[PDB]
Amino acid sequence: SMSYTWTGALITPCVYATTSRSASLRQKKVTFDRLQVLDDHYRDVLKEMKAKASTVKAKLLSVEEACKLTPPHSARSKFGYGAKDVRNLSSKAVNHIRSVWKDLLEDTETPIDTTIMAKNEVFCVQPEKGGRKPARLIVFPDLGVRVCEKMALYDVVSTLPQAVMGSSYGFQYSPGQRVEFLVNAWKAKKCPMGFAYDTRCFDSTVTENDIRVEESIYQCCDLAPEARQAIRSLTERLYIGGPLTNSKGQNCGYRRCRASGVLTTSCGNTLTCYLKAAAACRAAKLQDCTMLVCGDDLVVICESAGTQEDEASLRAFTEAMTRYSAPPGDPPKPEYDLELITSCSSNVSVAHDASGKRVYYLTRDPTTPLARAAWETARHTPVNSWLGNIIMYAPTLWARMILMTHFFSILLAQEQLEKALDCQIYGACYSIEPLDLPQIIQRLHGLSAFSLHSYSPGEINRVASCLRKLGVPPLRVWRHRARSVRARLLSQGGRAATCGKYLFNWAVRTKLKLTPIPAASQLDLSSWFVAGYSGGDIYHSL
């Protein structure tokens, strides 16, 4: 069937920001019929996955627990209440949620309505490698339905992926754990070869059968009867497909593929990508595979069979993925250096700690992080990508020297060091106080994140070239600015002094011997690197 059907009604509104004006261009790309052919490899992997899902015991969340996971600025319900009413457990909000839950238990077939919208994302004007990328489309059900999804499936999507995929489940890893996983996988092979596999419009390639197969995996959990019925009804009425309504309440058409804004998007995508890829690995006869899956993002590390054999095994892997309805965007290329693999937009790099000991860390091209941070300094945004980049890329040269320096100077000037800010980590929203950044960084990357040096010539040149292209002052200016930011922070004592001492130790003439932060141990990061929730409408306050 057609991934989408369009009435022609417009997807109306809610260096450059992506808008609803480019929606037509995205719609054309994501609209196609799917041809899927399953085989024995696919069926074998599925049974193996279900056998692992069978160990999971999932709990039904109470209305109250589901309400607390709702972001304060989550889209308002069309039934007369908003995210604040949900969080406060208001009568109107709660009564409506209960009527939605009751309807899921009673009605097993009627499709549930969804809103289609163009996402507003910031990208950098690259007139060299073509032009502007069209807006991604977000498809999501009403607030009432989203709270019900949490009651039925929050525990499932949070526990089942790890139980099924084990060490292959990418969302269980902090940045420090992810780099360690990739390094260990690479070092475990006699002659390693790795590749990233990019699926063209993954959500659109997800068939109705894939969504049912995905439910068959959920159904292996020990579940409460109402949770079991809610999952059965949500699959049939929402996950497999449904009608699309624009922001003006006009009918846009229909969807028979993955909705990007449902609780199960990340879990469903990860399970589907893993299933198809593990089966394709067997079809291609790739030897001693290690996979790392994050939604539609896949990395494979295996034993090289020779350069021509590897090129042949990758074409075979691609042919199998195509049969499973997961054709590629760019065709995959074998890599023989771990650093040359880009996965989840990141690459492994090496640096040294204070004692000259080798330290692996993940980095990326800083153009998009810098452009987005420039947009965020210019104007207010719901999520602060600068903060998530400081958190995730804390050991990088660019995040330490530019992002930490710039934003700490703004926070000092505005006296907003104590003001909690929202940021996204693996699709979940976190309200974070910037004064807590040293404790966060020590926990995710280790104490050495504050003492890294001997950055590679390639990394230094990529950062330096980027600054020049974007009209950002050179590294020497940042060192000078960080010294002043640091001095002001030190003079304040408490957490502010800790930010100064730890975050800006790279800036000083004579580096201080840094000791572990005592408050870092008592920091509750239990919900941080457990699962992915892209489009899942999840919130946590640290």
Ligand SMILES: O=C(O)/C=C/c1ccc(NC(=O)C2(NC(=O)c3ccc4c(C5CCCCC5)c5n(c4c3)CC(=O)Nc3ccccc3-5)CCCC2)cc1
């Ligand atoms: O010795 C040498 O050879 C050169 C010396 C030199 C060169 C330029 C300066 N610039 C400045 O002082 C000013 N801008 C900045 O001091 C500045 C700071 C951050 C900037 C950022 C981002 C960096 C990441 C955090 C958010 C802010 C961007 N741009 C920045 C400029 C340049 C800019 O204007 N916009 C963009 C656009 C896209 C991406 C980045 C930028 C402030 C007043 C006058 C302009 C200072 C010294």
Ligand SMILES: O=C(O)c1cccc(OCc2ccc(Cl)cc2)c1N1Cc2ccccc2C1=O
């Ligand atoms: O962007 C996403 O939603 C996303 C999706 C899949 C896998 C990811 O991380 C996988 C990874 C883990 C650690 C590192 Cl150092 C890089 C990549 C994602 N990341 C990347 C990111 C960078 C900065 C702020 C937040 C996020 C975030 O959530």
